[PDB]
Amino acid sequence: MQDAITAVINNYDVQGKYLDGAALDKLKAYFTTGAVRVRAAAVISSNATTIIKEAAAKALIYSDLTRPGGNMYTTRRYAACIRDMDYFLRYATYAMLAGDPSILDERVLNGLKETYNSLGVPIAATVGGIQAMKEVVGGLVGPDAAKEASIYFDYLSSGLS
């Protein structure tokens, strides 16, 4: 994977260039927002189960998914869905902290679409749930980290869809 710093470093190492003014400006732009990212990650880590619970209540449960004939029906399938929800939350937190969707591409979206196609999991329902924890995280974090948190949830939803 890669963060913002490692991404800039690799993008210049591939071209055989030293760090110039533009690279320094990009690094400074990432550096100026470091503390808000830490605050948002700490808030999400402290409120992990509440976010998934509210997202499930808003988008998944009380529907045909939880009833017989649903993909999320039965304790095992519901466990799989909520474990996936927690994994999405933690990887979104990692992506927001690192300032790069490289970790999301390498460790989340790689083969997950085809795996869900083979298993029968609802892609649209998963995307709606992911948008649900995106909304909850945006509400919890505040104005400081709302957009930066939301962009990686949007990245996950776009990759899945």
Ligand X SMILES: *[C@H](C)[C@H]1/C(=C/c2[nH]c(/C=C3N=C(/C=C4\NC(=O)C(CC)=C4C)C(C)=C\3CCC(=O)O)c(CCC(=O)O)c2C)NC(=O)[C@@H]1C
CA distance 91 to 85: 10
80 binds ligand X (CB under 6 A): yes
Q: Between residue 73 and residue 132, which ones bind a second copy under the rule CB under 8 A?
A: none
- Tokens found for residue 160: 């899945």
The phi, psi pair for 67, rounded to 5°, reads -90, 170
Is 77 marked within a binding site? yes
- Tokens found for residue 49: 């189960």
CA distance 46 to 118: 34
Is 6 marked within a binding site? no
Q: Between residue 49 and residue 68, which ones bind a second copy under the rule CB under 8 A?
A: 67-68
Q: Between residue 86 and residue 145, which ones bind ligand X under the rule CB under 6 A?
A: 87, 107-108, 112, 115, 119, 121-122, 125-126, 129
For the bound state, the minimum distance from the C-beta of residue 150 to other proteins, rounded and expressed in Å, comes to 18
The answer to whether the CB of 97 falls within 8 A of the CB of 41 is yes
CA angle 65, 69, 71 (to 5 degrees): 50
Helices 48-59 and 75-98 sit at what angle, rounded to 10 degrees?
A: 120
Task: Provide the annotated binding site for (2R,3E)-phycocyanobilin.
Answer: 62, 66, 71, 74, 76-77, 81, 84
Question: Residue numbers of the site for a second copy (CB under 8 A)?
Answer: 13-16, 67-69
Question: Residue numbers of the site for ligand X (CB under 6 A)?
Answer: 60-62, 65-66, 71-78, 80-81, 84-85, 87, 107-108, 112, 115, 119, 121-122, 125-126, 129
